[PDB]
Amino acid sequence: SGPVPSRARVYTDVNTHRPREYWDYESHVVEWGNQDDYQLVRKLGRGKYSEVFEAINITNNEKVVVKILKPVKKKKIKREIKILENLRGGPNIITLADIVKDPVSRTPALVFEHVNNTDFKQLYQTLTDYDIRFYMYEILKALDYCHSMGIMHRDVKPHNVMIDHEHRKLRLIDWGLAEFYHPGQEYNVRVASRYFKGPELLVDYQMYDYSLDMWSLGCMLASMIFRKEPFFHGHDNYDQLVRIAKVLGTEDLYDYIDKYNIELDPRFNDILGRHSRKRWERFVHSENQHLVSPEALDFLDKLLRYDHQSRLTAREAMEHPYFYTVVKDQA
């Protein structure tokens, strides 16, 4: 007997009810533009599959971000391009302004909306309880939207959240790991970064869904309210589950393994041990307590669950008392 199947609790068949061209990204014909419309000003960084620059679109003299792509599978590029196009205009989703190719090099580049970002290291330390609540709701707008559009981000982490604090403008970026949700589909578990990987990825449970992003949101929330980045600091993918098990406990972990008939890797047998579920109060101290409240702890507990099906959806999370003052101010 193999693993018990799983279906998303929400937006299950959204992609089945859409035209084939919506999710059939392999068939997408890419709309190239003029590489000479943009002039590179300076380097902003280097990704695994890209070189990032600040550019100026000369035709309308406006600041853009150019991601010059390193070789990666054409269908992976078609996937990111299709996802970005389906999500265009969505709340707090980065805008893909253009797709350009160097005439001589033949190397592709993606042009994005520029976000004058305040580095998450210097910013998070200055953030008030209201600021955390406000920006958490903004990420949730982006996740409810993309989930409702049949897409899982699969890489929610502080690096992929661009904030221009001065203009209170948040954008969920880097959709290169995103995928279309299809009921019954077994996905690649070697996605997301270590500290944000859901238990399903760590136990090698492939039939996952949008709820994976809700775990990553939980890890972000715990790091912000506890001033502990990263919250779950694993040495590898195996020790990462041990770090989670020391907090959430081993009983709920083995209950989850049993429920979905997961074949647990032999490595885990001698390292998971036996651990009680810890109360969130043990992470509370004098320099973080002004960010922690009963509403924050209730919310965080409802996101950080082993069983992906028992986690809050982005819509349920937006309806939690933690955001009552944020919701009130928006009206």
Ligand SMILES: N#Cc1cnn2c3cc(nc12)N1C[C@H](C[C@H]1CO)OC/C=C\COc1cc(cc2c1NC(=O)CC2)N3
């Ligand atoms: N899509 C998109 C997108 C939109 N804005 N934006 C910015 C950078 C960026 N991508 C975007 N990068 C840079 C690099 C790779 C890529 C992220 O995969 O990661 C390094 C981390 C960010 C450094 O922080 C900045 C990010 C941006 C602009 C500035 C700073 N830092 C300043 O001191 C003022 C100017 N905008």
